[PDB]
């Protein structure tokens, strides 16, 4: 089961990145591959882009957030859909998605953090992740 963020924004887990039917079902695009060893599995179907991230809490996710926010940016401009995932799409894909609202929509941590949740009930960013999303921002 994958949580919509934005009509063109898509959050899951890698079972929904193998998942080539309901892809295609849910006209996505562009796949986001936030996880580390997680194969991109249907190369000729998809635009992708893999970022390895670690799930833990002394990894700075902030860090990934340029390159990340580009390319969703990429699939909105191109009128796609982008799905966003990690391997269970808890904690990584999450915090890019929270981190992405903040960014994009100057949206606070607790009211992205809830749109997040209540679109993806697992999500759930470490604890180091979520500390990380309350500063950010803050200075801007």
């Known amino acids: 089961q994958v949580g919509v963020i934005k009509p063109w924004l898509l959050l899951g887990s890698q079972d929904a990145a193998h998942d080539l039917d309901t892809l295609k079902k849910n006209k996505v695009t562009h796949i986001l591959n936030v996880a580390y060893g997680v194969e991109n599995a249907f190369l000729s179907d998809f635009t992708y882009k893999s970022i390895s991230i670690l799930d833990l809490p002394e990894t700075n ?22 799905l966003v995932h990690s391997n269970a799409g808890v904690s990584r894909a999450a915090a890019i998605v929270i981190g992405f609202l903040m960014n994009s929509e100057q949206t606070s941590f607790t009211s992205a953090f809830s749109l997040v949740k209540n679109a993806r009930p697992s999500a759930c960013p470490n604890s180091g992740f979520m500390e990380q999303l309350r500063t950010y921002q803050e200075g801007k």
């Open 61 to 82: 996710i902030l860090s990934y957030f340029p390159e990340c926010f580009e390319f969703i940016e990429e699939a909105k401009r191109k009128d796609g859909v982008v």
